[PDB]
Amino acid sequence: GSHMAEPQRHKILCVCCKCDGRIELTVESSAEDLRTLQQLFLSTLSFVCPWCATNQ
Numbered sequence: 001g002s003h004m005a006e007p008q009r010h011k012i013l014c015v016c017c018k019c020d021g022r023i024e025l026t027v028e029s030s031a032e033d034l035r036t037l038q039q040l041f042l043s044t045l046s047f048v049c050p051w052c053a054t055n056q
């Protein structure tokens, strides 16, 4: 195995909102930031992959 389990360093995987491709949002976010941005992405926010961001 390996060991990488630390606070802040959190991998919140969402998607490219236009190709459904997996965006593992590797962030360094405290629990409450992670929670808050969870609610935003659950609500209305979403991201795009750099391929789609370059294409449209």
Ligand SMILES: [Zn+2]
Pocket (backbone or CB within 6 Å): 016, 017, 018, 019, 020, 021, 048, 049, 051, 052, 053
């Ligand atoms: Zn995309």
